[PDB]
């Protein structure tokens, strides 16, 4: 054909069993389970990891064994840590993760796609992702290197290692929920770049490196940070209406954390993050104020844009949740926390692609360039 | 609904840069056939310029252009250490990915900008030479080294890699290879980079994603795999027996044959074949490789030509690189592929972002379980 599939919009790149999105009803399901239902149940993030890799929820016995395999990933090579710590402290957190995974990809010379080993490799890698993200956070904050230790909770192991203090139940539960809510979202740009890479039968780690490279871009990563920076500009909940007039109605700025190219209604992840942000910010005065600004701005934005299908997305409230847990705005750390969660879905999609529907991804382009012409000696060129 | 499997015949962008005729076997860069380019003795730096600017340079333009590329011959210590800290057994192209990823992190002031993109890309072509020299040195257990200005980009590269003055023959061969690998429209590596830069991620991250794809054996590794099959055959009298016992019977894939676009002889393979014959003729032990390769080639075409399956560029390029002086180990040839292809990747990235930017965000067909109630772990 001569038609261009701009943005590959509504091109189906694969079939999946993993995730469905109903952008008109605002329903997000992982293997048939609503994210609302998963969060209401108090499911551990590891159960949902298992769901993505195995296709069903685990028994208590299966979960115990699964957690052991993930925990193998908490031990990573010094050179992987150095791939982060040798970088400028001003580097984006996600580019740090990418530099680390890239080093790992080089070193994993015995990786081979195999139905008998893929899931164990992915599980251990989910552990490695926690180890890496801890050390990205530490480097950024000019703290010593640290690794996660085994615990009954992946969210707990992560937070304790990141901050070097004992996380509270409330902090652990909120991080657990964030990890579940960012687990997957079918085939966004990151998942797609990763699929192209593994479609050449490149290794899992290279697939993740490609996903990271996409996620870094501000049309994919960076949105939670941008929502926070917008609430910070407003500063005071009493000034929301004026700010909205002075910046949004007049078209000076885009409203951050609104709109989505699949959801034309409220993002179900945002609906869940809102309740959590309310609760976690409740007893932290400075964060409470950011929440109050967010909710007042939200009313204005929905009133202005709702009729056009433009509503809060997941990045509107996730920032307040991460801030409340204790992560800072700098270096796009929130986007690194996105990649931490999403490495489950990335790898589940890569496995599903290579194992069951493998085909090299090799599209075409429409040529609009010059007609055939003859090379002229440089001395003759004017 | 319908799955576009392998995105086969899906158009992901328009381009001015490269056209491929799969039936005639013609490959043109901005209207110039690669046969004409090589026959005319083009400098690789001329073709780099063509990609980034849309025309062949004047003498003055080229002089200026070369200066910009040479800025990239200096890269930071931490970039070299991103390579030298890795296990020596790591694939060459994976070492390149680690180095470019480190670079992507540090390049915090990168912004897509019509006024600067080409200069960024030019310098990154220099940095790719620096990176590749260091990947080669690391694998070979040699000291670090940076390329220096010389009469040509191909010379600067070989002299630094090897730590000796390359011969005229070796420099011209490398120059040809760099031209021939410059671009091939939207293969998997270029596609992955495009996906990345479609989020407005930086050029270096686009290169990183391209390298991730190139690592896989359905894209990278074929020139190496071709040499390895020739080395299995061992003696030219054994060609037909090996072919019957390995290829006709489906035991092994015939390496360096077949293409998603070419359904005829790859024009790059045509040019590489002539060079491989001339260079190997001068070195008996490599000439043996050539003799096996050309004997095998006839059998393969005889068997598979009718199916549109012919030699591709990777069938003879391995002989050329081994003649120049590069060894088989660690898939060094695939790093040489990346060294050249970085020009095409960057040129496609700039073209996409500057003139037809849109987030790449496809869909999937759902075939998973229907809606179900979550069940507490205790009750499972
Ligand atoms: O669905 C998308 O394209 C972007 C997004 O919300 C995600 O990756 O979670
Ligand atoms: O074009 C392809 O699909 C693979 C190839 O020959 C290249 O990238 O040069």
XYZ file of C-alpha atoms and ligand atoms in Angstrom:
780
model
C 0.000 0.000 0.000
C 0.786 3.732 -0.179
C -1.155 4.786 2.948
C 0.928 5.596 6.042
C -0.224 4.152 9.377
C 0.562 7.309 11.288
C 1.548 6.442 14.878
C 0.469 2.894 14.038
C -2.920 4.054 15.301
C -5.353 1.092 15.511
C -2.700 -1.202 13.894
C -2.718 -4.504 15.832
C 0.903 -5.529 16.413
C 0.111 -8.789 18.331
C -2.660 -10.647 20.162
C -2.450 -10.679 23.991
C -4.034 -12.486 26.936
C -2.489 -10.099 29.423
C -4.393 -6.800 29.525
C -7.555 -5.155 28.079
C -8.366 -1.481 28.093
C -11.951 -0.187 27.532
C -11.189 3.465 26.821
C -14.908 4.354 26.661
C -16.019 2.773 29.928
C -12.619 3.377 31.602
C -12.005 -0.292 32.547
C -8.534 -1.725 32.861
C -8.255 -5.526 33.413
C -5.216 -7.771 33.933
C -6.087 -11.332 32.775
C -9.776 -10.597 33.321
C -9.337 -9.056 36.807
C -10.330 -5.360 37.188
C -7.615 -3.202 38.719
C -10.311 -1.887 41.098
C -10.994 -5.392 42.295
C -7.274 -6.253 42.656
C -6.589 -3.130 44.784
C -9.795 -3.584 46.925
C -8.655 -7.173 47.618
C -5.298 -6.120 49.091
C -3.414 -8.484 46.718
C 0.345 -8.276 46.959
C 2.155 -6.956 43.899
C 3.937 -10.360 43.630
C 0.573 -12.080 43.023
C 0.040 -9.835 40.018
C 3.630 -10.364 38.800
C 2.853 -14.088 38.912
C -0.448 -13.492 37.035
C 1.442 -11.773 34.192
C 4.111 -14.486 33.914
C 1.943 -17.603 34.534
C -1.514 -16.583 33.348
C -3.291 -17.301 36.652
C -3.142 -16.109 40.241
C -0.792 -18.225 42.407
C -1.576 -20.516 45.284
C 0.075 -19.781 48.659
C 2.682 -22.471 47.742
C 3.363 -21.076 44.264
C 3.710 -17.539 45.753
C 6.254 -18.704 48.297
C 8.430 -20.243 45.553
C 7.879 -17.231 43.217
C 9.097 -14.765 45.899
C 12.317 -16.794 46.296
C 13.039 -16.559 42.562
C 12.415 -12.770 42.552
C 14.677 -12.374 45.505
C 17.604 -13.908 43.547
C 17.472 -10.613 41.629
C 18.357 -8.551 44.711
C 21.962 -9.573 44.122
C 23.365 -7.718 41.114
C 27.044 -7.219 39.883
C 29.150 -4.321 41.087
C 29.701 -3.296 37.425
C 25.873 -2.863 37.041
C 25.868 -0.601 40.091
C 28.876 1.227 38.634
C 27.021 1.679 35.315
C 24.677 3.934 37.379
C 27.157 5.548 39.809
C 29.737 6.531 37.093
C 27.063 8.749 35.438
C 26.452 12.440 36.100
C 24.138 12.924 39.067
C 21.960 15.210 36.894
C 21.039 12.336 34.493
C 17.365 11.346 34.276
C 16.615 8.407 36.629
C 15.173 6.394 33.681
C 18.399 6.964 31.575
C 20.319 5.663 34.632
C 18.119 2.541 34.674
C 18.752 2.185 30.928
C 22.581 2.422 31.319
C 22.343 -0.300 34.041
C 20.121 -2.678 32.091
C 22.326 -2.129 28.969
C 25.385 -3.301 30.976
C 23.405 -6.325 32.181
C 22.312 -7.143 28.657
C 26.001 -7.193 27.523
C 26.963 -9.495 30.366
C 24.069 -11.984 30.022
C 25.785 -13.983 27.258
C 23.955 -17.230 28.098
C 20.476 -15.863 27.751
C 18.346 -17.914 25.353
C 14.579 -17.797 24.656
C 13.101 -21.004 26.122
C 9.613 -21.836 27.393
C 11.238 -23.690 30.362
C 13.370 -20.791 31.604
C 11.776 -17.489 30.405
C 9.519 -17.023 33.464
C 12.319 -17.634 35.952
C 14.582 -15.175 34.079
C 11.745 -12.574 34.085
C 11.067 -13.105 37.826
C 14.738 -12.726 38.784
C 14.838 -9.629 36.520
C 11.858 -8.076 38.411
C 14.099 -8.466 41.488
C 17.071 -6.933 39.576
C 14.840 -4.013 38.614
C 14.219 -3.274 42.354
C 18.033 -3.481 42.978
C 18.754 -1.185 40.081
C 16.080 1.374 40.988
C 17.295 1.489 44.615
C 20.799 2.282 43.361
C 19.533 4.854 40.859
C 17.685 6.626 43.714
C 20.766 6.396 45.980
C 23.155 7.764 43.325
C 20.818 10.664 42.581
C 20.580 11.478 46.322
C 24.376 11.117 46.885
C 23.862 8.178 49.239
C 25.903 4.983 49.440
C 25.037 1.957 47.319
C 22.455 -0.494 48.888
C 20.644 -3.692 47.849
C 17.088 -4.887 48.764
C 16.866 -7.716 51.308
C 14.340 -10.582 51.267
C 11.065 -9.849 53.051
C 7.502 -11.065 52.727
C 6.821 -7.947 50.577
C 8.536 -6.745 47.404
C 7.187 -3.196 48.055
C 8.678 -3.361 51.586
C 12.146 -4.625 50.427
C 12.206 -1.885 47.843
C 11.273 1.061 50.095
C 13.477 -0.029 52.977
C 16.522 -0.246 50.691
C 15.739 2.917 48.821
C 15.341 5.192 51.851
C 17.558 3.253 54.356
C 14.771 3.443 56.913
C 11.915 1.114 57.893
C 8.892 1.948 55.748
C 5.470 2.233 57.425
C 2.547 -0.130 56.642
C 0.773 2.803 54.926
C 3.852 3.563 52.792
C 4.314 -0.077 51.868
C 0.638 -0.549 50.922
C 0.620 2.646 48.775
C 3.839 1.483 46.927
C 2.274 -1.979 46.505
C -0.750 -0.344 44.874
C 1.449 1.911 42.635
C 3.407 -1.194 41.514
C 0.171 -3.009 40.543
C -1.402 0.008 38.850
C 1.669 0.594 36.546
C 2.212 -3.139 35.825
C 1.047 -3.031 32.235
C -0.963 -1.157 29.756
C -1.130 -3.388 26.648
C 1.161 -1.939 23.869
C 2.267 1.668 24.656
C 5.398 3.164 23.025
C 7.844 1.537 25.577
C 6.265 -1.952 25.275
C 6.259 -1.500 21.532
C 9.993 -0.461 21.210
C 10.767 -3.564 23.403
C 8.657 -5.829 21.152
C 10.530 -4.604 18.024
C 13.805 -5.468 19.784
C 12.782 -8.965 20.947
C 11.224 -9.614 17.557
C 14.837 -10.027 16.215
C 15.198 -12.581 19.019
C 17.330 -10.124 20.937
C 17.583 -10.953 24.657
C 15.079 -9.990 27.348
C 17.463 -7.363 28.817
C 17.914 -5.660 25.423
C 14.041 -5.674 25.136
C 13.858 -3.841 28.444
C 16.689 -1.385 27.372
C 14.638 -0.471 24.256
C 11.421 0.023 26.362
C 13.372 2.328 28.680
C 14.748 4.349 25.695
C 11.021 5.056 24.707
C 9.731 5.648 28.198
C 12.382 8.404 28.674
C 10.671 10.686 26.102
C 8.315 13.365 27.552
C 5.302 12.055 25.512
C 5.494 8.885 27.588
C 7.615 9.475 30.735
C 7.687 12.690 32.727
C 3.900 13.286 33.139
C 3.640 12.733 36.915
C 6.524 15.160 37.383
C 4.809 17.673 35.127
C 1.488 17.408 37.132
C 3.441 18.055 40.389
C 5.332 21.027 38.891
C 1.908 22.506 37.806
C 0.393 22.138 41.307
C 3.625 23.702 42.697
C 3.202 26.761 40.395
C -0.254 27.324 41.816
C 1.225 27.020 45.336
C -2.044 27.820 47.246
C -5.476 26.089 46.758
C -7.146 29.526 46.940
C -5.344 30.576 43.711
C -6.460 27.666 41.481
C -9.237 29.560 39.712
C -6.969 32.543 38.865
C -4.151 30.266 37.749
C -6.561 28.261 35.584
C -7.769 31.493 33.906
C -4.237 32.942 33.559
C -2.707 29.723 32.107
C -5.252 27.196 30.760
C -8.291 29.190 29.475
C -5.926 31.599 27.702
C -3.945 28.703 26.141
C -0.557 29.622 27.665
C -0.017 26.107 29.032
C -1.417 22.596 28.553
C -3.190 21.073 31.600
C -0.780 18.319 32.801
C -1.991 14.827 33.689
C -5.172 15.257 31.610
C -6.156 13.356 28.405
C -5.212 10.004 27.040
C -5.196 8.531 23.564
C -7.091 5.445 24.730
C -9.124 6.674 27.722
C -11.855 9.172 26.722
C -13.152 9.013 30.303
C -11.542 9.055 33.760
C -8.562 6.705 33.912
C -9.398 3.893 36.363
C -5.813 4.084 37.725
C -6.319 7.777 38.442
C -9.605 7.104 40.254
C -7.709 4.669 42.527
C -4.623 6.931 43.004
C -6.899 9.845 43.971
C -8.270 8.017 47.091
C -4.771 6.935 48.054
C -3.327 10.441 47.567
C -6.189 11.830 49.750
C -5.398 9.359 52.544
C -1.585 9.437 52.441
C -1.415 13.273 52.162
C -4.068 13.662 54.926
C -1.661 13.904 57.833
C 1.218 15.642 55.999
C 0.274 19.378 55.852
C 2.553 20.381 52.894
C 1.487 17.377 50.805
C -2.198 17.845 51.826
C -1.996 21.311 50.259
C -0.718 19.833 46.955
C -3.675 17.408 47.093
C -6.160 20.249 47.705
C -4.700 22.199 44.712
C -4.928 19.038 42.566
C -8.575 18.322 43.398
C -9.652 21.963 42.930
C -7.824 22.120 39.553
C -9.383 18.785 38.579
C -12.893 20.247 38.883
C -12.057 23.103 36.615
C -10.311 20.829 34.106
C -13.197 18.315 33.925
C -15.681 21.170 33.555
C -13.630 22.614 30.684
C -12.556 19.386 28.881
C -14.785 16.479 30.033
C -17.227 16.873 27.155
C -14.267 16.438 24.788
C -13.233 13.099 26.421
C -10.283 14.685 28.234
C -10.100 13.622 31.920
C -7.465 13.026 34.583
C -5.055 10.237 33.684
C -2.996 8.059 36.009
C -0.203 10.709 36.167
C -2.460 13.364 37.645
C -2.448 11.833 41.191
C 0.463 9.296 41.192
C 2.990 12.092 41.940
C 1.173 12.952 45.221
C 1.277 9.258 46.175
C 5.047 8.995 45.490
C 5.705 12.369 47.288
C 3.687 11.073 50.278
C 5.788 7.803 50.288
C 8.874 10.102 50.299
C 10.232 10.274 46.736
C 11.371 13.727 45.460
C 10.520 15.552 42.228
C 14.107 15.686 40.890
C 15.599 13.781 38.063
C 12.197 12.359 36.964
C 12.371 9.717 39.719
C 8.609 9.114 39.322
C 9.227 7.911 35.717
C 11.882 5.468 37.139
C 9.162 4.209 39.557
C 6.912 3.771 36.448
C 9.663 1.675 34.791
C 10.107 -0.310 38.079
C 6.476 -1.396 37.924
C 6.209 -1.712 34.164
C 9.189 -4.112 33.743
C 6.636 -6.915 34.697
C 4.322 -6.122 31.779
C 7.298 -5.456 29.374
C 8.770 -8.859 30.046
C 5.287 -10.681 30.077
C 4.631 -9.152 26.611
C 8.080 -10.106 25.246
C 7.666 -13.721 26.420
C 4.123 -13.959 24.982
C 5.413 -12.539 21.649
C 8.525 -14.613 21.171
C 7.081 -17.875 22.537
C 3.700 -17.923 20.717
C 3.593 -15.437 17.813
C 7.179 -14.735 16.858
C 7.775 -12.718 13.695
C 10.500 -10.186 12.860
C 9.004 -6.644 12.890
C 10.137 -5.046 9.664
C 7.733 -2.401 8.210
C 8.189 -0.185 5.151
C 8.252 3.561 4.339
C 6.669 5.536 1.527
C 9.370 7.041 -0.608
C 8.966 10.769 -1.366
C 12.588 11.447 -2.093
C 14.471 12.374 -5.289
C 14.203 10.463 -8.526
C 17.250 8.499 -9.725
C 20.246 10.776 -10.389
C 23.914 10.277 -11.251
C 26.815 10.825 -8.888
C 28.892 13.924 -9.805
C 32.629 14.239 -8.832
C 32.985 16.610 -5.856
C 35.358 18.932 -7.884
C 32.488 19.453 -10.337
C 29.843 20.322 -7.678
C 28.485 23.838 -7.422
C -9.750 -8.298 14.244
C -6.713 -8.366 11.881
C -3.103 -8.562 13.191
C -0.456 -6.855 11.024
C 2.064 -9.734 11.647
C 5.663 -8.415 11.558
C 4.206 -5.080 10.427
C 4.736 -6.613 6.966
C 3.898 -4.015 4.239
C 2.780 -1.505 6.971
C 4.161 2.003 6.212
C 5.414 3.535 9.399
C 6.652 6.856 7.897
C 7.499 8.588 4.558
C 11.165 9.089 3.728
C 13.409 10.928 1.319
C 16.448 9.015 2.393
C 16.466 5.538 0.881
C 14.496 3.512 -1.616
C 14.563 -0.243 -2.051
C 13.249 -2.081 -5.132
C 12.849 -5.682 -3.948
C 12.194 -7.071 -7.451
C 14.894 -5.299 -9.429
C 17.398 -5.336 -6.596
C 18.105 -1.627 -6.471
C 19.160 0.345 -3.403
C 19.393 4.129 -3.734
C 20.462 6.753 -1.215
C 18.686 10.069 -1.947
C 18.423 9.098 -5.676
C 22.021 7.689 -6.034
C 22.398 3.914 -6.590
C 24.938 2.205 -4.359
C 26.572 0.761 -7.519
C 27.124 4.324 -8.826
C 28.323 5.536 -5.419
C 30.997 2.863 -5.130
C 31.983 2.871 -8.847
C 32.493 6.681 -8.556
C 34.797 6.309 -5.530
C 32.635 8.330 -3.115
C 34.061 9.104 0.343
C 31.939 7.727 3.135
C 31.818 11.284 4.600
C 30.091 12.405 1.397
C 27.333 9.832 2.010
C 26.987 10.758 5.702
C 26.482 14.369 4.471
C 23.928 13.215 1.887
C 21.922 11.608 4.611
C 21.939 14.467 7.037
C 21.555 17.308 4.403
C 19.751 15.743 1.407
C 22.475 16.452 -1.213
C 26.116 15.649 -1.915
C 28.377 18.335 -0.313
C 30.568 20.871 -2.006
C 34.305 20.776 -1.217
C 33.787 23.589 1.357
C 30.723 21.898 2.905
C 32.633 18.609 3.224
C 35.635 20.292 4.836
C 33.325 21.871 7.423
C 31.350 18.620 7.852
C 34.527 16.535 8.544
C 35.557 18.992 11.287
C 32.224 18.492 13.012
C 32.471 14.687 12.799
C 35.989 14.862 14.262
C 34.655 16.584 17.429
C 33.182 13.184 18.238
C 36.651 11.564 18.334
C 36.874 12.801 21.916
C 34.501 10.931 24.260
C 34.470 11.029 28.097
C 36.313 8.521 30.260
C 33.041 7.208 31.739
C 31.825 6.297 28.243
C 35.021 4.280 27.612
C 34.565 2.759 31.083
C 30.963 1.777 30.223
C 32.640 -0.590 27.689
C 35.836 -1.580 29.602
C 33.959 -2.545 32.797
C 31.970 -5.262 30.984
C 32.985 -8.978 30.780
C 35.222 -9.408 27.724
C 32.903 -12.206 26.440
C 30.072 -9.636 25.899
C 28.893 -9.183 22.253
C 30.537 -6.180 20.568
C 27.129 -4.624 19.690
C 26.015 -4.986 23.384
C 29.182 -3.127 24.495
C 28.212 -0.359 22.011
C 24.678 -0.302 23.573
C 26.060 0.096 27.073
C 28.333 2.984 25.942
C 25.579 4.813 24.033
C 23.162 4.344 26.968
C 25.743 5.949 29.298
C 26.028 8.791 26.773
C 22.191 9.158 26.534
C 22.096 9.612 30.346
C 24.809 12.321 30.410
C 23.388 14.292 27.465
C 20.910 16.177 29.577
C 20.818 19.252 27.378
C 19.875 17.439 24.188
C 16.786 19.026 22.478
C 15.203 18.229 19.082
C 15.900 21.392 17.049
C 16.139 21.969 13.294
C 19.154 24.239 13.826
C 21.237 21.724 15.778
C 20.105 18.136 14.934
C 22.498 17.683 12.045
C 25.531 18.899 14.001
C 24.555 16.598 16.903
C 24.239 13.688 14.491
C 27.551 14.531 12.787
C 29.459 14.562 16.063
C 27.683 11.304 17.166
C 28.976 9.676 13.931
C 32.520 10.621 15.217
C 31.595 9.268 18.698
C 30.460 6.029 17.120
C 33.966 5.576 15.624
C 35.519 6.342 19.107
C 33.083 3.852 20.784
C 33.702 1.131 18.230
C 37.531 1.489 18.464
C 37.181 0.992 22.236
C 34.807 -1.929 21.964
C 37.358 -3.600 19.602
C 40.308 -2.740 21.950
C 38.477 -4.066 25.014
C 37.558 -7.357 23.364
C 41.168 -7.739 22.117
C 42.687 -6.946 25.573
C 44.358 -3.792 24.210
C 44.746 -0.339 25.814
C 42.090 2.323 25.169
C 42.653 4.558 22.162
C 40.796 7.373 20.430
C 40.594 8.017 16.644
C 42.506 11.051 15.297
C 41.987 13.269 12.239
C 43.424 11.726 9.069
C 42.674 11.900 5.355
C 39.420 9.903 5.878
C 36.891 8.716 8.457
C 37.564 5.068 7.419
C 41.335 5.574 7.941
C 40.892 7.303 11.352
C 38.756 4.339 12.407
C 41.105 1.486 11.218
C 44.336 3.176 12.432
C 42.858 3.631 15.961
C 41.243 0.168 16.097
C 44.402 -1.679 15.050
C 47.041 0.750 16.409
C 48.936 0.587 13.066
C 48.793 2.524 9.813
C 46.156 0.900 7.582
C 46.997 0.257 3.933
C 45.301 2.001 1.061
C 43.522 -1.307 0.203
C 42.233 -1.781 3.735
C 41.021 1.835 3.999
C 39.132 1.712 0.651
C 37.472 -1.586 1.621
C 36.340 -0.195 4.978
C 35.140 2.928 3.238
C 32.994 0.770 0.924
C 31.606 -1.219 3.826
C 30.667 1.988 5.732
C 28.848 3.230 2.640
C 27.070 -0.055 1.998
C 25.763 -0.369 5.561
C 24.789 3.303 5.950
C 21.011 2.764 5.680
C 18.343 0.331 4.629
C 15.038 2.253 5.125
C 13.088 0.856 8.155
C 14.520 -2.544 9.284
C 13.907 -3.685 12.817
C 16.787 -1.595 14.351
C 15.683 1.648 12.639
C 12.056 0.848 13.585
C 12.884 0.385 17.262
C 14.820 3.700 17.299
C 11.849 5.346 15.619
C 9.483 4.067 18.302
C 11.830 5.551 20.943
C 12.238 8.971 19.348
C 8.435 9.031 18.643
C 8.029 9.802 22.436
C 10.500 12.697 21.809
C 13.162 10.718 23.688
C 16.746 11.914 22.774
C 18.820 10.853 19.727
C 21.151 8.731 21.874
C 18.272 6.804 23.389
C 17.021 6.208 19.799
C 20.469 4.749 18.929
C 20.334 2.643 22.118
C 16.922 1.121 21.161
C 18.259 0.491 17.563
C 21.330 -1.348 18.981
C 18.961 -3.465 21.242
C 17.168 -4.665 18.140
C 20.365 -5.180 16.081
C 21.660 -7.554 18.791
C 19.117 -10.242 17.892
C 20.255 -13.021 15.501
C 17.382 -12.324 13.069
C 18.995 -8.894 12.428
C 22.619 -8.810 13.668
C 25.138 -11.631 13.624
C 24.588 -12.889 10.044
C 28.017 -11.964 8.584
C 29.557 -13.915 11.478
C 27.081 -16.820 11.011
C 27.992 -16.959 7.238
C 31.752 -17.188 7.999
C 30.963 -19.877 10.622
C 29.038 -21.991 8.053
C 31.888 -21.636 5.519
C 34.333 -22.760 8.294
C 32.146 -25.855 9.055
C 32.294 -26.867 5.394
C 36.108 -26.706 5.788
C 37.075 -27.859 2.254
C 35.463 -26.857 -1.101
C 35.084 -30.491 -2.223
C 32.806 -30.981 0.792
C 30.400 -28.203 -0.179
C 27.726 -30.313 -1.848
C 27.714 -32.957 0.900
C 27.445 -30.318 3.657
C 24.632 -28.558 1.715
C 22.656 -31.775 1.252
C 23.225 -32.936 4.866
C 22.493 -29.526 6.536
C 20.485 -27.284 4.273
C 18.416 -29.453 1.862
C 17.351 -31.571 4.853
C 16.348 -28.496 6.958
C 18.823 -29.144 9.806
C 20.399 -25.642 9.633
C 19.411 -22.272 8.137
C 21.455 -21.143 5.111
C 23.206 -18.046 6.558
C 23.492 -14.807 4.561
C 20.522 -15.790 2.307
C 17.044 -14.272 2.186
C 15.547 -10.869 2.904
C 12.197 -9.349 3.964
C 12.429 -6.900 1.045
C 14.882 -8.304 -1.599
C 13.337 -11.187 -3.576
C 16.389 -11.047 -5.817
C 20.224 -10.757 -5.402
C 20.992 -8.009 -2.870
C 22.847 -5.192 -4.695
C 25.149 -4.838 -1.676
C 26.057 -8.500 -1.915
C 26.944 -7.988 -5.593
C 29.446 -5.267 -4.684
C 30.804 -7.104 -1.601
C 31.346 -10.304 -3.659
C 33.780 -8.466 -6.084
C 35.673 -6.928 -3.192
C 35.747 -10.211 -1.229
C 37.283 -11.982 -4.286
C 39.980 -9.305 -4.774
C 40.966 -8.927 -1.089
C 40.862 -12.592 -0.139
C 42.866 -13.493 -3.350
C 45.825 -11.849 -1.683
C 45.612 -14.036 1.452
C 45.497 -17.827 0.723
C 43.750 -18.864 3.992
C 40.972 -16.295 3.431
C 40.785 -17.118 -0.276
C 39.797 -20.665 0.806
C 36.808 -19.105 2.623
C 35.855 -17.248 -0.537
C 36.085 -20.407 -2.673
C 33.739 -22.247 -0.317
C 31.364 -19.291 -0.136
C 31.023 -19.035 -3.977
C 30.563 -22.839 -4.360
C 27.837 -22.806 -1.655
C 26.244 -19.729 -3.235
C 25.489 -21.612 -6.494
C 23.756 -24.438 -4.600
C 21.715 -21.990 -2.527
C 20.518 -19.980 -5.555
C 19.776 -23.266 -7.428
C 17.659 -24.389 -4.452
C 16.025 -21.175 -3.240
C 16.171 -18.512 -5.997
C 12.702 -19.605 -7.211
C 11.397 -18.769 -3.754
C 12.876 -15.219 -3.919
C 15.682 -16.251 -1.506
C 19.167 -15.053 -2.615
C 22.519 -13.873 -1.120
C 22.140 -10.830 1.040
C 24.792 -8.315 2.108
C 25.935 -10.480 5.010
C 26.896 -13.410 2.810
C 30.238 -11.860 1.610
C 30.797 -8.892 4.008
C 32.438 -11.213 6.608
C 35.161 -12.094 4.110
C 35.748 -8.414 3.510
C 36.053 -7.542 7.222
C 38.329 -10.557 7.828
C 40.552 -9.435 4.944
C 40.692 -5.867 6.426
C 41.836 -7.536 9.700
C 38.814 -7.969 11.980
C 38.341 -11.318 13.687
C 35.169 -13.442 13.970
C 34.948 -13.438 17.789
C 32.333 -11.516 19.869
C 30.338 -10.637 16.698
C 32.659 -7.725 15.943
C 31.138 -7.641 12.398
C 27.743 -6.636 13.858
C 29.484 -3.722 15.729
C 30.906 -2.702 12.302
C 27.311 -2.850 10.960
C 26.189 -0.511 13.802
C 29.218 1.786 13.247
C 28.030 2.383 9.659
C 24.219 2.234 10.303
C 24.341 4.999 12.985
C 24.247 7.505 10.092
C 20.984 6.084 8.703
C 19.406 5.663 12.144
C 20.080 9.347 13.082
C 18.955 10.579 9.607
C 15.650 8.683 9.981
C 15.164 9.921 13.525
C 15.653 13.545 12.546
C 13.364 13.128 9.537
C 10.603 11.617 11.692
C 10.756 14.085 14.572
C 11.276 17.208 12.495
C 8.592 16.599 9.805
C 6.141 13.861 10.749
C 6.212 13.464 14.577
C 3.489 11.242 16.081
C 3.725 8.952 19.143
C 3.915 5.354 17.942
C 1.214 3.555 19.944
C -0.337 0.481 18.270
C -3.014 -1.828 19.798
C -3.272 -5.564 20.498
C -6.136 -8.010 19.906
C -7.358 -9.374 23.231
C -7.685 -13.147 23.455
C -7.349 -13.482 27.235
C -9.838 -14.590 29.920
C -13.230 -12.943 30.142
C -14.073 -10.763 33.154
C -13.643 -12.621 36.423
C -13.875 -11.939 40.174
C -10.692 -11.756 42.127
C -10.346 -14.617 44.598
C -8.341 -14.221 47.880
C -5.110 -16.272 47.979
C -6.246 -18.225 51.085
C -9.215 -19.560 49.062
C -7.270 -20.534 45.912
O -1.347 3.600 27.369
C -0.400 4.426 26.949
O -0.136 4.545 25.666
C 0.392 5.253 27.908
C 0.006 4.843 29.311
O -1.011 5.300 30.031
C 0.844 3.717 29.868
O 1.827 3.190 29.175
O 0.472 3.377 31.065
O 16.680 -4.455 5.660
C 16.432 -5.391 6.543
O 15.219 -5.766 6.851
C 17.676 -6.001 7.208
C 18.875 -5.505 6.354
O 19.393 -5.962 5.179
C 19.429 -4.226 6.873
O 18.920 -3.659 7.943
O 20.341 -3.769 6.115
